[PDB]
Design a protein around this ligand. Structure first.
Ligand code: HEM
Ligand SMILES: OC[C@H]1O[C@H](O[C@H]2[C@H](O)[C@@H](O)[C@H](OCCCCCC3CCCCC3)O[C@@H]2CO)[C@H](O)[C@@H](O)[C@@H]1O
Length: 462
């Protein structure tokens, strides 16, 4: 008849002494063994409600969408955002910024396909330049996803050796890792205390600021050469809305929202898609039978000549199930992004007060044994029926659900399929490390799950 059951906390340190050393997710998976799918965990001084498994996640985010559609904070970035931009906004602010984003993301968007195709070719082009040398694919996979989002937002794409562009992508990488670091998870619990001392949070804050100053300077240029009848990109469109509303008593179209909303899209748009790729090719190195089986489907469906295209999808159910599996296994946001309830809410006989944070442990759905047979292993069959046809599932929710559902899943999936197939079409992969010696153990597991560094060669097939 009250907030969900869970480990009895202490004053000051909530459930610190019951956490697991390996981090927040490990801790939660245990607490689940004992407490069930719905439970409270005091992270520092606050009863954060965890929801696990597809039933429960779906029941909150969908059936109770209103109650569960609010946004929590990520302690490590909150000092910078403080509720601005679409990702971290609530109430009307979010409403406006979500609508704005979704509409202008499509407008130049869902041509988007043409831009991914073009970028995919600049990409092949660069991988030829490497001449099969060993390389860390990190910056490139970042470049390509970033360029898609940049073209939509700044109206252009960046050269792969643009120093100032590489500087931006370095900041995203570091930042996401600092966030996901163990000090990151620790900061989630004790930022009240830890904020007053040195540590990664200050690096993150500084980084976000740098990125934001670039965005801000770019906004200034857009303003100087703005043509009210020929809006170039998302920033221009924003600037016009800003003008339209400048007499409205409260516009959410403020400079803070412009800069941070842009940053949110720019960053979000870059990080996960590229990471999925990174973790995807490490999986190809570890399982070449899957890689060449994907090639043999590229063979039949596209041949080795024609740029692949979104239409090819339906005809390539294996490649598609391979991608779904890469996503599932990668599990890139094991805990999604934090929610809050917007009212005093009933859930399974429990009561969650207004404004009680809620974590939807997406990872528990992507690993649910009722839906996947060896949840811990990389196996495309998980997305295939007996006939080798595509088998989508209720539990594949790496984008979350509901009103906060990833507003980029559409473009993320285009990018994923396009970039993936266009690479495999042209290249084969090898590394020094023998397949079964390849370690899939992530180098960070916090807010994000981050794959180890690896070296890779792309050998031509001509
Ligand atoms: C496979 C890659 C991606 C994954 C797995 C992913 C996943 C997610 C998740 C888990 C959330 C919030 C979850 C929740 O609170 O329920 C989210 C929201 C969001 N994503 Fe992504 N995302 C991906 C790619 C992208 C891309 C390409 C963009 C392009 C802009 C993007 C932009 C955003 C934004 C702006 C939000 C905020 C949604 C809101 O607050 O209404 N993401 N995504
Ligand atoms: O020139 C900058 C340098 O100044 C910095 O130190 C600050 C740290 O950054 C700063 O974090 C530390 O602050 C002392 C924290 C004391 C707050 C006590 C809190 C306890 C919890 C309850 C609220 C209060 O002061 C340090 C020394 O003044 C540090 O000397 C160097 O860290 C840094 O070289």
């Amino acid at each position: 008849g009250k907030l969900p059951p869970g480990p009895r906390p202490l004053p000051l340190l909530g459930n610190l002494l019951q956490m697991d050393r390996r981090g927040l997710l490990k801790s939660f998976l245990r607490f689940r063994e004992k407490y069930g799918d719905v439970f409270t965990v005091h992270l520092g001084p606050r009863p954060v409600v965890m929801l696990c498994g597809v039933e429960a996640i779906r029941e909150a985010l969908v059936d109770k969408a209103e109650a569960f559609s609010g946004r929590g904070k990520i302690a490590m970035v909150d000092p910078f955002f403080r509720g601005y931009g679409v990702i971290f906004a609530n109430g009307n602010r979010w409403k406006v910024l979500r609508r704005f984003s979704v509409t202008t993301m499509r407008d130049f968007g869902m041509s988007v396909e043409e831009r991914i195709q073009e970028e995919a070719q600049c990409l092949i082009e660069e991988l030829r330049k490497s001449k099969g040398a060993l390389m860390d694919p990190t910056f490139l996979f970042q470049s390509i996803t970033a360029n898609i989002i940049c073209s939509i937002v700044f109206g252009k794409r960046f050269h792969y050796q643009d120093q100032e562009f590489l500087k931006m992508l370095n900041l995203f990488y570091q930042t996401f890792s600092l966030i996901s670091s163990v000090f990151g998870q620790l900061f989630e619990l004790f930022s009240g205390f830890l904020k007053h001392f040195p540590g990664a949070h200050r690096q993150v804050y500084k980084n976000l600021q740098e990125i934001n100053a670039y965005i801000g300077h770019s906004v200034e240029k857009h303003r100087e050469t703005l043509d009210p009848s020929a809006p170039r990109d998302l920033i221009d469109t924003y600037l016009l809305h800003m003008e339209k509303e400048k007499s409205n008593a409260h516009s959410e179209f403020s400079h803070q929202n412009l800069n941070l909303n842009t940053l949110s899209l720019f960053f979000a748009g870059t990080e996960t898609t590229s990471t999925t790729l990174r973790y995807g090719f490490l999986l190809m190195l570890k399982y070449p039978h899957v890689a060449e089986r994907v090639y043999r489907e590229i063979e039949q469906v596209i041949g080795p000549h024609r740029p692949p295209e979104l239409h090819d999808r339906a005809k390539m159910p294996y490649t598609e199930a391979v991608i779904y599996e890469i996503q599932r296994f990668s599990d890139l946001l094991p805990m999604g992004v934090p929610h809050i309830v917007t009212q005093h809410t009933s859930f399974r006989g429990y009561i969650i007060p207004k404004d009680t944070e809620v974590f939807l442990i997406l990872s528990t759905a992507l690993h649910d044994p009722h839906y996947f047979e060896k949840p811990d292993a990389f196996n495309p069959d998980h997305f295939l029926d007996a006939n080798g046809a595509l088998k989508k599932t209720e539990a594949f929710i790496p984008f979350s659900l509901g009103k906060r559902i990833c507003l980029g899943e559409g473009i993320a999936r285009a990018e994923l399929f396009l970039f993936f197939t266009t690479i495999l079409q042209n290249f084969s992969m090898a590394s020094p490390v023998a397949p079964e010696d390849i370690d899939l153990t992530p180098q960070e597991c916090g807010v994000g799950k981050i794959p180890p560094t690896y070296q890779i060669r792309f050998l031509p097939r001509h």
